[PDB]
Design a protein around this ligand. Sequence first.
Ligand SMILES: [Mg+2]
Ligand SMILES: [Mg+2]
Ligand SMILES: [Mg+2]
Ligand SMILES: [Mg+2]
Ligand SMILES: [Mg+2]
Ligand SMILES: [Mg+2]
Ligand SMILES: [Mg+2]
Ligand SMILES: [Mg+2]
Ligand SMILES: [Mg+2]
Ligand SMILES: [Mg+2]
Ligand SMILES: [Mg+2]
Ligand SMILES: [Mg+2]
Ligand SMILES: [Mg+2]
Ligand SMILES: [Mg+2]
Ligand SMILES: [Mg+2]
Ligand SMILES: [Mg+2]
Lengths: 203, 205, 144, 100, 51
Amino acid sequence: GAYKFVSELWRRKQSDVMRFVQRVRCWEYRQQPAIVRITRPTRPDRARRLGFKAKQGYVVYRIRVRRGGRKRPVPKGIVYGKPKHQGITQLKFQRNKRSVAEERAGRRLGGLRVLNSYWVNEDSTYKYFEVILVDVAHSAVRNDPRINWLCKPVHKHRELRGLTSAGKKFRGLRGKGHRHHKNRPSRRATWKRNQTVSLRRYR
Amino acid sequence: VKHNNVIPNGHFKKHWQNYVKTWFNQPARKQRRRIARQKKAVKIFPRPTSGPLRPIVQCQTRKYNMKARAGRGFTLEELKSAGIPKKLAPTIGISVDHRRKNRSLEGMQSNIQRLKTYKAKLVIFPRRARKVKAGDSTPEELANATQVQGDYMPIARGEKRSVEVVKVTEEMKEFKAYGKLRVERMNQRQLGARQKKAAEAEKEE
Amino acid sequence: TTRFKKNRKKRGHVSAGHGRVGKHRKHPGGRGNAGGMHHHRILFDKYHPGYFGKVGMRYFHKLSNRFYTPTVNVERLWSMVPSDKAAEAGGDKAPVVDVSQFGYFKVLGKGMLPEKPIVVKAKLISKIAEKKIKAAGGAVVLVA
Amino acid sequence: SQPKSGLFVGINKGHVVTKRELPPRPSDRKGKGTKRVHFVRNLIREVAGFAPYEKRITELLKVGKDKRALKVAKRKLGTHKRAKKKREEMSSVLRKMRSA
Amino acid sequence: GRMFAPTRIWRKWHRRVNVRLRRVAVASALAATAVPAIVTARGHRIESVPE
RNA sequence: CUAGUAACGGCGAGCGAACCGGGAGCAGCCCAGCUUGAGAAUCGGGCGGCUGUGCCGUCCGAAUUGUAGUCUGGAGAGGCG
RNA sequence: CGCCCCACGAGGCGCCGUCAACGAGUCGGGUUGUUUGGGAAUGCAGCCCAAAUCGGGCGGUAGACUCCGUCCAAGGCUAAA
RNA sequence: CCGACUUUGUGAAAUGA
Ligand SMILES: [Mg+2]
Ligand SMILES: [Mg+2]
Ligand SMILES: [Mg+2]
Ligand SMILES: [Mg+2]
Ligand SMILES: [Mg+2]
Ligand SMILES: [Mg+2]
Ligand SMILES: [Mg+2]
Ligand SMILES: [Mg+2]
Ligand SMILES: [Mg+2]
Ligand SMILES: [Mg+2]
Ligand SMILES: [Mg+2]
Ligand SMILES: [Mg+2]
Ligand SMILES: [Mg+2]
Ligand SMILES: [Mg+2]
Ligand SMILES: [Mg+2]
Ligand SMILES: [Mg+2]
């Protein structure tokens, strides 16, 4: 039982052991390309719990993403409108950077399907997410009873559409009661359902 | 606006004509659902068409607490005390609901009574032809089973209106029920101050 | 029914019934309740006194179930008693009625009662209702 | 607990129905600390060390200023409920270090 | 161009009548047939019908 | 249906859901973890054979930074019947 | 309708009391923008703060305490309507 | 333009506690 030991070791993220081993990795990462194939998870126990396996076809990609919000890309900062949509620089994006990393890897890696992603490193400029992807064509993945669900055609570009673990968080689906009822089935499906003027036959 | 009228409140400022929902497919909905039910019945011949069994439960919510209705499944405690295993109740057409809680013997015994009646009037075909194992039923019993239709156990929604006639005792007449009703409203209002005054007796006294 | 619509009778009269001098333009008074405090003021303060302003304290997440108390006056109770169990009675024996079996919670007290004793059994009652029932000789049982 | 009063208003109001005592369920022990996980967390506590706010709380307790220790623990952790119990755990870790 | 106020599918194609008023109407439809004079006045050829 | 209601709003114009209840349909599941260590029991690819959506024999390889197996909180692991 | 007969392995049921592990820059907090009916802040997002295991989230007014009811997140799949 | 937090580590003295 090593994964529990390494789990608390990675829980104590302000201890000096993680401060060291994590700053040196931050340098190494900052010196490599944005999207890079890594042959082993750096956080094997985090990957286990999110469905990584030491089995062929599960690949791990380190995607570097930048930090900070979204500044409105207009011709100078000149927004034609009323004073209430006339701001530029304090707006925040509506997808977490974890999902942005998954959806960068989704565009780079055409043939493979994103499964999950987990935080590994960060600094003032960047965050680093290690994204578990699956090759849906190799026989070792086609013959696993537990992960066929990803080879059915309704699962193309999950991350491009909001269906992974990080996707649901920004979709508002971590939550069940009120406080989260408008986000099921989706906020736009709720909006349509609530706007339909139902005119019955014998109204 | 103009002459005395109720103040207008039409919610017709968005693009509502893009979302008008007209119901002209309503009869076809009915016919489609009917065909769906008919073919489900044909596939599940000779299981009852009502599907699996359900519990008598009370509704929530003061408005409806006094009205019984159908539930989602018998709790593990009923399924255990009826001799009907957890894993096997959905197999023999009894729902199971792991989430409910039983707080009253009355509810628990009522749902046991439904389980016992169902197990009395349930017939189960053998998994194979000649091999009749435990829980099955006799060939001559099986030969007369049909597809029971509709609600083969109706749940009476509320207790029947009986208005009987009894003595008017003087120990009944003397009871001041309005004063009673006001006194415990006092008890509820004062429960704060009374327990404060009490607790300070321990603190100081 | 188009054949009854009075516009069909205004065919041939140039103005279609909205005047020559002052015409029928689009919205000469604003869209809807506009000008409540400005020019429709006379209207809103003559025919709708009390429209403008805040009164009373907010109640977050009101559930209408918690405010639910269907009432019955005393005058209605004997209708609840079928004739044959009205006859199965004497001077001293009275029918026992549980109103909750009828869907009422409170038993208010408007109206007459006969001399006949009646034993109502309710979840709430008022002053006057019990006074009328006792004065009729019947009694009260509180339940829930 | 004991049944309702049976009268529609008042302290413990409602309808009398005979109450039943619910046998324990899993997730009634949810989070009951266990021998091995206490082992695991102990060991990595010692191997990793203390965070800087944890060390500052140790210092405020080894001086004895428990109000300030709570105050900084709150400003870090976020809520009174967690701040008080992080202070409680650092008092534990400091008594168990002065014990020898 | 268009037509003025183009017709829309959400006109009131179906109308409702009280169920008891349908029952009243069908009873008074029956009650009128039992009359040879109104069956005739409605246009049917009834001159050899026995009763 | 709740409900143009609670709410929200230069509390102005306006905006506006939810629990309860009635119906339609109803179905639950599987992983990571402590748990083969007398023994990787797992998977893939090449080649060959057949009964060909696969199965078998052999070689190479992946995998001990853990594949498979038990377990998923309603439990469960054990011992007993 | 016929030939093949299902076990010492798994499950169920009952007894036990000893175990009984449950997902981390994740929740939570501050602040900022947007969003909402969500109002001392409904969601979401950035930044900074940054966890717990007699423990965590809720009970629609911010707060401390006592009790109560409730559920167990941060991994995944799932027809019908 | 400016301050604070952040990437941001290592150790030395002088004044303040
Ligand atoms: Mg614009
Ligand atoms: Mg428009
Ligand atoms: Mg004229
Ligand atoms: Mg003319
Ligand atoms: Mg006119
Ligand atoms: Mg004109
Ligand atoms: Mg003139
Ligand atoms: Mg005019
Ligand atoms: Mg003029
Ligand atoms: Mg003016
Ligand atoms: Mg045309
Ligand atoms: Mg209404
Ligand atoms: Mg937006
Ligand atoms: Mg907000
Ligand atoms: Mg804000
Ligand atoms: Mg899904």
